[PDB]
């Protein structure tokens, strides 16, 4: 009954398997019924707000709604306050830069409903001069997210009470997450003894950045995939 005679676990007989059996299954399959449900749900939403919902997309368990910027406040209000949706938590807001589009920036909102245990995504668009309506009036938590989106991308949010840089240095010029902003920026700092202060100077690198993306594959890697649309959401063929 002492630690001196505690049994040696190191010499207990271990389990020994001969062959491990792991069947081959496509991970997407488990989503199929849920995918159908999301389709049905999205149809309802688009039928209820046809003034606003430009479209929707469904990938395995993620539902996205696509709307114009002027649609953001009503649809968001709906998503927050309708009894079947009840998306009370704002998860994140960010932007994605698409330089080929006439509207560079797509603004992405993710929402969570703890009531229904459900997530949803909402997209709109913007440019370097056309703002988006701030949703701080609906979610206080949105505040900082919009600030980050302004700091990284330059998207403005109309109605934001206090919109300023949150990440970058004071007086930083540029929006670093744009595809045309260079990786190491334009300016670097050092301590200047003549001036007795930290000074900013044009960037100079002892070793230049080496960009190895020139070695990307010359062959298309994955192909088209397969479509998981339910049969109730495909147009019929005549006969």
């Amino acid at each position: 009954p002492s630690w001196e005679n505690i049994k040696d676990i190191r010499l207990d007989p271990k389990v020994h398997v001969d062959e491990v059996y792991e069947p081959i299954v496509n991970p997407a399959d488990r989503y199929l019924q849920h995918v159908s449900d999301l389709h049905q749900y999205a149809k309802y939403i688009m039928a209820a707000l046809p003034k606003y919902i430009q479209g929707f997309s469904v990938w395995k368990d993620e539902l996205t709604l696509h709307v114009a910027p002027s649609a953001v406040i009503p649809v968001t209000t709906f998503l927050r306050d309708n009894t079947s949706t009840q998306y009370k938590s704002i998860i994140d807001i960010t932007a994605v830069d698409y330089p080929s589009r006439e509207n560079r920036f797509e603004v992405v909102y993710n929402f969570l409903s703890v009531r229904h245990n459900s997530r949803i995504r909402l997209k709109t668009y913007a440019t370097e001069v056309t703002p988006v309506p701030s949703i701080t009036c609906l979610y206080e938590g949105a505040n900082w997210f919009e600030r980050e989106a302004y700091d990284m991308y330059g998207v403005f949010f109309e109605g934001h009470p206090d919109l300023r840089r949150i990440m970058t240095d004071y007086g930083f010029e540029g929006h670093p997450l744009r595809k045309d902003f260079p990786l190491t920026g334009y300016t670097e700092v050092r301590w200047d003894e003549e001036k007795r202060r930290v000074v900013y100077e044009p960037l100079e690198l002892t070793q230049a950045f080496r960009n190895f993306s020139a070695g990307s594959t010359a062959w298309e890697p994955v192909g088209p995939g397969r479509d998981d649309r339910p049969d109730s959401f495909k147009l019929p063929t005549p006969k």
Binding site: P131, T136, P161, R164, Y170, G171, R197, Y200
Partner: protein, 123 residues
């Protein structure tokens, strides 16, 4: 709730260039009035008139911009900069980025003609 900070202005894109002109001249007045506060916060060597001159030069740079959206963005960013300077959020190091001329002569050789630029491989 999450309340705004000192000298915060909610973002509003003016629908008209005259309604923006009013706001812009008000921002210019704010900068000129804060110049002495700036000279005290940032312990600058130069004079208050130098600060006000610099402010005028900044506002002058965009004197001929036409598109309303661009002027709206220039105004909103200028107000952000005012809020940053007046709240002492900036340190001296970033504030002095605005005054490159105030530093002393960087050297004997700043080329102006083709030959001088060519001798320094800058032609």
């Amino acid at each position: 709730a999450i309340i705004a900070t000192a000298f915060a202005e909610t973002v509003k894109f003016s629908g008209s260039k005259q309604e923006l002109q009013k706001r812009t001249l008000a921002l210019y007045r704010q900068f000129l009035r804060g110049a002495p506060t700036f000279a005290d916060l940032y312990e600058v060597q130069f004079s208050i008139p130098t600060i006000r001159t610099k402010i005028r030069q900044e506002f002058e740079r965009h004197r001929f911009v036409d598109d309303l959206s661009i002027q709206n963005v220039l105004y909103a960013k200028g107000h952000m900069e005012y809020q940053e300077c007046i709240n002492f959020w900036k340190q001296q190091a970033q504030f002095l980025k605005y005054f490159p001329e105030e530093d002393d002569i960087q050297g004997r050789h700043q080329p102006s003609n083709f030959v001088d630029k060519f001798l320094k491989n800058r032609a």
